[PDB]
Amino acid sequence: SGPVPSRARVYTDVNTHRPSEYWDYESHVVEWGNQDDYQLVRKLGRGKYSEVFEAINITNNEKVVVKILKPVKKKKIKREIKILENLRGGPNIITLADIVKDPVSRTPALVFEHVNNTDFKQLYQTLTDYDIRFYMYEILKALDYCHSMGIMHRDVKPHNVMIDHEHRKLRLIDWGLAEFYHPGQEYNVRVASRYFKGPELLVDYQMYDYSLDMWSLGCMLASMIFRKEPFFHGHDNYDQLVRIAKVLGTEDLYDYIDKYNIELDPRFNDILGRHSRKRWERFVHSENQHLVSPEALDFLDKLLRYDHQSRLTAREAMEHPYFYTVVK
Ligand SMILES: COC(=O)CC(=O)NCCCNCc1ccc(-c2ccccc2)c(Cl)c1
Ligand SMILES: Cc1ccc(O)c(C(=O)O)c1
């Protein structure tokens, strides 16, 4: 009679018990600031429907970041604004400082606190085992907070984690794909970036939850400790599941599909094959052995699981022995 329903093991009913004002982003009243308070400095990057600039707030001479959105879907912009306002002040969440519009071009923009991004290319060679544990803990603070607030980020990846290494400061950014969690809701599986997509998205299981972010975090941890970027290198969404199955094995994949009565897409028929469950110790090499430990591999094993309900929650992850050396 179709797939088996699922719900989050934590913060299941946080939105259910809150008034509509909190989660009904379509009814939210957006109020513009003065675009003339900002002078654009330089282009930082581009998204599918966004351009990000460093700017200066001319009223206080403080640097900010301005994300100009191509308003292809108004409802999506309202959602990102409402989520950002709800989460404002959370640990390691990027702070939305203002929302402005360009009257001429009819374009909205979001203004954020400035983060001085450290270029990872130089950082990646210098990070120690302790540094990886420290920053992983900072990401978990951000995720436990947003999950506790009934929000799934749905786009956890290295590009969305900004680190100012000199000040040991981390911010989780780009809440454009984030959504409110409502138990039993069937969500769109076209979220997250290919390498970071959880198995639930790849098998088109729509009743997913906060645990999706924990898979994505597991992919980032594996890539950092093993110095393998990305860890699961799929060439398309179907091949992405095959890359996962080459590590986790096909036996546990069938156990997962069976548990939720998922119908595997026919496109998997000639590409999935048969794969044994690999030991995590097989990814250890001379280049990465100084970042790997038994505690790291046990932690990784508890995140990178097909069954979304079996993965550690952000709060359980924070209590793992891997973080015994970090200040809580
Ligand atoms: C144009 O858009 C923007 O300006 C945004 C923008 O500039 N983004 C680039 C941010 C790239 N961050 C790279 C990075 C570095 C280290 C880690 C990490 C290492 C060890 C443990 C935990 C995390 C992560 Cl996850 C990411
Ligand atoms: C600070 C910052 C930089 C780039 C971005 O794309 C964002 C965001 O989308 O929230 C934030």
Check residue 292 and give left, alpha or beta (phi > 0: left; psi -120 to 50: alpha).
beta
- CATH classification number, 24-114, choose in 3.30.200.20, 3.30.70.20, 1.10.3300.10, 3.40.50.1820: 3.30.200.20
Pocket of ligand 1 (CB under 6 A): 44-45, 52, 117, 120, 123, 127, 132, 135-136, 139, 158-159, 161-163, 220, 224
| 213 closest CA partner among 299, 80, 314, 281 | 314
Q: For residue 57, how many C-alpha atoms fall within 13 Å in the half-sphere facing its CB?
A: 17
311 CB neighbour count, 10 Å cutoff:
23
309 CB neighbour count, 10 Å cutoff:
14
- CATH classification number, 6-23+115-328, choose in 1.10.230.10, 2.30.40.10, 1.10.510.10, 3.40.47.10: 1.10.510.10
List b or e across 24-61, with b for residues whose CB sees 16 or more CB atoms inside 10 angstroms: ebeeeeeeeeebebbeeeeeeeeeeeebbbbbbbeeee
- Whether residue 266 has a cis bond before it, omega within 30° of 0: no
Shortest-distance atom of ligand 1 to CA 173: 5
Does the annotation flag 46 for ligand binding?
yes
| 128 closest CA partner among 280, 283, 292 | 292
> How distant is the alpha carbon of residue 29 from its chain centre?
27
Shortest-distance atom of ligand 2 to CA 47: 6
Nominal resolution in Å? Answer: 1.7
- List every span in the chain annotated with CATH 1.10.510.10: 6-23+115-328
> How distant is the alpha carbon of residue 119 from its chain centre?
20
Residue 45's contacts (CB-CB under 8 Å, 6 or more residues apart) are 51, 52
- List every span in the chain annotated with CATH 3.30.200.20: 24-114
Residue 75: its H or E element: helix 74-87
Residue 296: its H or E element: helix 294-303
| 214 closest CA partner among 89, 83, 309 | 309
**Token pair recorded at residue 228:** 């393998």
Gap between the Cα atoms of 184 and 66, Å rounded = 36
> How distant is the alpha carbon of residue 118 from its chain centre?
19
State whether the Cα torsion 30-33-36-39 is positive or negative.
negative
Gap between the Cα atoms of 126 and 287, Å rounded = 12
Whose C-alpha lies nearest to ligand 1, atom 15?
Answer: 120
- 69 in helix, strand or coil? strand
Does the annotation flag 197 for ligand binding?
no
Question: Which residue do the tokens 């983060």 mark?
Answer: 115
Does the annotation flag 242 for ligand binding?
no
Q: How far apart are the first and last CA of the chain?
A: 46
Q: Is 37 a catalytic residue?
A: no
Pocket of ligand 2 (CB under 6 A): 52, 65, 67, 94, 112, 115, 173-175
Gap between the Cα atoms of 219 and 308, Å rounded = 14
